[PDB]
């Protein structure tokens, strides 16, 4: 059974641990691991450490030489309007795959890693909603294993961990707090979820093991809140297309968290300079909820007609259309997996965040037409949506 | 639920019915309407009714003219190595949706149509074996729907109906009889299955109504037993590809059903001409099962290595595949699907009143053996669908 499995798999091996490992830094941060440079997290993160620190930032890249691993990184940086070539003698490209042993490194290359890292901020992930828990294991699961092994080698170095929501589970009445515990492996669905949370689970012992970690959970990770910039491929952006294409939307019951990147990446970069965050977990949700209905009038506002309908009706009509259009087709795979309220959302609490970021000045984005307007507006401008009749 | 829509659609429009309409043809076939020459089964049934009729073979086809309707036919056949030039007289695409009401066709060509025609092959039908039934019910269910409309309007036209087996439930030990009673709606699994249950009841009751009628249900169709011919994108085709590059094949303990398209196509004509055929249903399917180990030791004759898995392990293996492998994981969505150690349940299917009706003709099922799969497996490497064997 498949809780069998991620139980076994969220023990963490027993070397992994302090041992005889050197010391944290405790002066001034020289090195940074980041994984997930070529995501989309990814790339803000990145930017955001540029201009946060005054660290080399060695990124984890598939690549097959360290050249076109730079150019896999600019390349994702550029689409989301974030690089200049300053940042190029700042970024030490490592090949390697968070999916493999070791990182992909030999034990010569991983040894050297051990030693040049001072943190770890671990962003690395394969996100598929359609897939089952072995496809991402690898990834997810061994690949949170490797980075805690490197976070113990040689000498100690903290570890900002960035999680998801999506290890809570679904059916909550209340809004899930920052610090309760993990419940039991059935309570998730779908291999994503799963995934993350046996990862989530060997962070948390390697914490208990005396590992420094902060516990970075995102919520639904939407746009940058200025620019619009938004992978297209996210699957909220299919959702919104497939909305406006048919004209057609749900009404769902569920409390709606957008979450804009850029308040994610300076959160995450936030909490992670603050020694108070070190075994901590945080909600990097948005504060403020909108409401399916108030979500359709700012898309109507913005120029999109939108008839509204019960969730499965919604659903049906999704489904008729995708007698004829492959696109819908592929929507309709992702909702398909799990009635008249719609599908259950998980709503979260983020007390603990809102407190630590008070004298920041990072703050999220409320959800508003005018938000809404610069999303489409992007999307729009980059051929994904039609203009507005 | 579901079920309940689907007998709700299977209750056929009172009006589509025999009525005035004029007596269907006594006499030689002048025209036939083809739905699905575009399709695989319909490249090989369009080529074969060019061969043993003379009558006019009407395409139904989605294209903006007749013309590009004909390419569209054309290069299908083509691609099939089934096209000459001789056929193009004999082939009149009609421009049109199994979709839409009438066929795609305004009232005036439908009623032009309704004139014109004298016999019907119906093969065209959507297949999506991943999609809801609410998404083939337009092209499946109203579109066979269309079809008893059209066969029913001016003037009788019989009625060749592709059907499935994926009509009946799965699971069952004995060889399920042609003629046994269809079950109700809830015994079977998946929007495609569903859609053909519906349809298949609808032209039921055409035929308790007096439409003449043929029900053919092959079982899984594929390559052509001489040439290989056989649509790659096919779902036996992607398996056999992910167990090749995987080099580890299932051990499951169905008894595999391979039916060549050649067979399929050449009994549904042979039945089809058959007056013993009107109201009676045909499986068209392998008479000899083959077991997936033999399977697999045909292969590996052919120069692939295969490991052996359970089920089980198997389909973990192509999850575990699939992280690093889009192709792996397009196949990994079609098995997932169902919530035993012995691997998916399949359907098997008496074939003794197809058997005794072509006994008479030279229409016989080739066996599965290493030879049948050597002429599929040399086929889809010279098409670079898979790697020559080491």
């Given at each position: 059974d498949v809780t069998v499995e991620m139980e076994a798999d969220a023990v963490l091996d027993a070397?992994?641990?302090?041992?005889?490992a050197l010391p944290p830094v405790?002066?001034?941060?020289r090195t940074i691991l980041l994984t997930g440079a070529t995501g989309f997290l990814g790339a803000f993160l990145l930017e955001e450490l540029c201009r946060r620190t005054d660290a080399r930032i060695y990124c984890l890249v598939r690549s097959k030489t360290e050249q076109e691993g730079m150019n896999r990184i600019r390349k994702n940086l550029e689409s989301y309007s974030?690089?200049?070539?300053?940042?190029a003698p700042r970024i030490v490209p490592v090949r390697g795959d968070?999916?493999?042993?070791?990182?992909?490194?030999?034990e010569k290359e991983f040894q050297r890693l051990s030693e040049e890292i001072d943190a770890i901020y671990h962003n690395g992930a394969l996100v598929n909603f359609?897939?089952?828990?072995e496809s991402m294991r690898a990834a997810n699961v061994l690949g949170t294993r490797e980075i805690l092994r490197l976070a113990t080698r040689t000498r100690i170095k903290p570890l900002h961990y960035v999680s998801t929501v999506s290890v809570l589970p679904l059916g909550r009445k209340a809004p899930i707090r920052e610090d309760e515990p993990l419940e039991g492996p059935s309570s998730l669905v779908g291999g994503y979820a799963q995934s993350k949370w046996v990862a989530e689970k060997l962070v948390r012992e390697a914490s208990r093991r005396g590992l420094p970690v902060t516990i970075l959970r995102p919520g639904r990770v939407t746009g940058?809140?200025?620019?619009?910039?938004?992978?297209?491929?996210d699957l909220v952006c299919r959702t919104l297309k497939g909305c406006v294409r048919m004209g057609v939307a749900p009404s769902v019951d569920a409390l709606l968290d957008l979450t804009p990147v850029d308040y994610v990446s300076s959160a995450i970069v936030d909490l992670s300079m603050?020694?108070?965050?070190?075994g901590q977990t945080y909600?990097?949700?948005?504060p403020q909820f909108v409401r399916a209905d108030e979500m359709w009038n700012y898309m109507r506002a913005f120029g999109y007609g939108l008839r509204v309908l019960p969730y499965d009706q919604w659903l049906s009509e999704l489904g008729s259309a995708a007698s004829s259009d492959s696109e819908l087709g592929d929507l309709l795979m992702f909702l398909?997996?799990?009635?008249?309220?719609?599908p259950r959302m998980v709503v979260c609490d983020s007390g603990d965040t809102l407190k630590a970021l008070g004298?920041?000045?990072t703050s999220c984005p409320s959800v508003d037409a005018s938000l809404i307007s610069t999303y489409l507006s992007s999307l729009v401008h980059r051929g994904f949506l039609k203009a507005p009749e």
């Open positions: 070397e992994i641990a302090l041992g005889k405790t002066g001034a941060l974030l690089w200049n070539e300053a940042l968070i999916g493999q042993p070791l990182l992909g490194l030999s359609l897939y089952p828990y940058h809140s200025r620019t619009g910039a938004w992978n297209t491929d603050r020694p108070e965050s070190i909600h990097l949700v948005n398909q997996q799990v009635s008249v309220g719609g004298g920041t000045g």
